């Protein structure tokens with residue numbers, strides 16, 4: 016066991032990630048491959064995301080619920096290799112296997128069919144916070160790629176396509192708000208290609224995040240328009256209020272956001288000193304550490320409690336580390352590893368001078384702040400830390416996302432650690448050829464068709480394959 020980190024983020028990113036998530040007390044490993052323990056330091060971030068997102072969807076009329084985890088084989092057949100099957104209880108074998116949900120479309124929609132008789136029963140907007148299981152045999156990674164993960168999943172059903180199309184973008188923007196405003200992570204809004212869209216849906220919208228350390232992208236969240244494909248599978252129908260006799264199928268959406276958010280936060284903002292928490296999601300925004308007798312020792316404790324109560328009065332999540340068995344230097348390293356945005360340091364000389372040293376986690380700057388200006392200055396520093404983290408991550412993404420129009424430039428830019436927007440024909444066969452040619456997975460797959468591309472096509476613009484014309488500028492790159 017060692018004091019600080021041992022692996023540089025730019026040297027061994029895998030070892031760096033494992034050291035950051037464990038020494039920040041976020042992740043503990045489990046004896047089942049692909050499953051990881053969420054320690055309170057990690058789970059508190061998820062609770063911050065949950066508190067924000069849950070209040071926002073309720074403002075939109077979505078209500079919470081809980082559907083069973085187990086799916087009958089019959090329900091799944093209405094619509095495979097990553098689904099986990101329960102086959103016995105104790106020593107007795109079940110009559111037939113039952114599946115653990117990888118997603119709850121086939122669980123809820125049989126119930127949706129019973130609840131919809133007329134168009135007045137629509138819309139139905141439900142969300143549940145729960146766990147799903149996707150038992151893939153690919154290489155797992157904590158937070159990012161796990162066999163079990165926590166998420167929310169929203170499932171809406173409307174009578175018109177126009178209501179559904181509007182919610183898809185509304186939910187997607189809330190997902191962007193979670194990454195941009197809470198996690199200080201920039202994302203690219205876009206549409207998945209036909210190959211990468213949700214199976215059984217019409218179109219899939221997504222937010223793509225970029226990990227600069229690896230040059231790989233990852234899907235931060237998704238919002239599907241299922242159209243009428245699932246309402247035809249489960250007979251979610253209603254009598255047409257404008258045409259008697261004929262029946263209509265409901266238009267549906269589904270949208271999900273997982274704990275992968277936390278791992279992206281770690282990969283983007285974490286440095287060689289450990290984790291870095293955005294002040295918006297840090298359960299401890301300011302940690303007070305006494306610095307520099309037995310009565311003078313009690314003096315530092317009283318002043319640390321005074322700053323603690325004053326910060327609580329201005330709604331600043333503050334905690335004081337008054338433990339007598341750890342030296343100040345140890346606490347400096349400890350709370351630096353955990354990513355607390357501000358380390359409030361109070362010593363004997365600073366206290367007698369009505370001062371204290373505030374250390375920004377993002378930049379390491381030591382700011383000497385007077386006692387009278389404690390509430391206002393610490394709020395300004397917290398605000399500037401959130402802005403700085405987002406601005407640096409934003410310009411990092413902008414400089415690593417460029418445009419290429421030939422496979423030669425595509426490959427050269429891809430090898431420099433960037434993601435590229437290329438003229439793409441949209442076909443699945445060409446997308447497979449792009450991944451195979453760029454692999455020589457090390458190959459590039461499609462990320463999204465950007466809502467706002469960097470440039471536009473022109474009449475006669477050919478795809479990178481050269482055989483089909485280009486339909487849209489599409490973002491490609493190596494992915495998680």
Ligand SMILES: O=C(NC1Cc2ccccc2C1)c1nccnc1NC(=O)N1CCCCC1
Nearest residue numbers: 149151153154155159160161162164271273275
């Ligand atoms: O897809 C995940 N895991 C599977 C891929 C993989 C790779 C290696 C080993 C096992 C597995 C299972 C995932 N894992 C953790 C957290 N979020 C995850 N998913 C998502 O964030 N998205 C976007 C939102 C809708 C759902 C999909």
Ligand code: PRO
Nearest residue numbers: 118168237269270271
């Ligand atoms: O798994 C998915 O991608 C969608 C979104 C949450 C529910 N089903």
Ligand SMILES: [Cl-]
Nearest residue numbers: 065143144145
């Ligand atoms: Cl919960």
Ligand SMILES: [Zn+2]
Nearest residue numbers: 440445478480
């Ligand atoms: Zn093509």
